[PDB]
């Protein structure tokens, strides 16, 4: 679980406007039936922006438009952006959940 757009010198730093967020396939998916990765975005001061269910795509993109508008006016209520972000995902399917993978970053 990492961002491939991270600055060369600093891992904590990303240079692009969108977070090129990518992760790895869960090794036991083949036996498991259809699976969906739930992605949760956390704002500064611990607030949570959204929980996005992702399936069949292993590289998620957080377009700059989302940071600019999806949550500047929803949570904060004013025109702005968020720089310090926390990302973390999980791998869960139907008729059950996998809370071990909930812990990430």
């Amino acid at each position: 679980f990492r961002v491939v757009n991270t600055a060369s010198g600093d891992v904590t730093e990303f240079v692009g406007p969108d977070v090129k967020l990518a992760w790895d396939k869960i090794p036991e998916e083949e036996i498991i039936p259809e699976i969906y990765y739930t992605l949760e975005i956390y704002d500064s001061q611990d607030r949570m922006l959204r929980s996005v269910r992702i399936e069949d795509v292993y590289t998620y993109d957080y377009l700059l438009t989302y940071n600019k508008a999806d949550f500047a006016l929803l949570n904060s209520g004013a025109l702005g952006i968020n720089r310090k972000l926390r990302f973390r995902i999980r791998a869960e399917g139907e008729n059950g959940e996998q809370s071990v993978g909930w812990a990430t970053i």
């Binding site: 240079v15 692009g16 406007p17 700059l64 600019k68 025109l79 702005g80 952006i81 720089r83």
Partner: peptide, 15 residues
């Protein structure tokens, strides 16, 4: 200004 600042952000001066 880095790549984060869009045209609207530049106009608003906020970022």
């Amino acid at each position: 200004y880095d790549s984060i600042i869009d045209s609207e952000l530049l106009n608003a001066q906020i970022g």
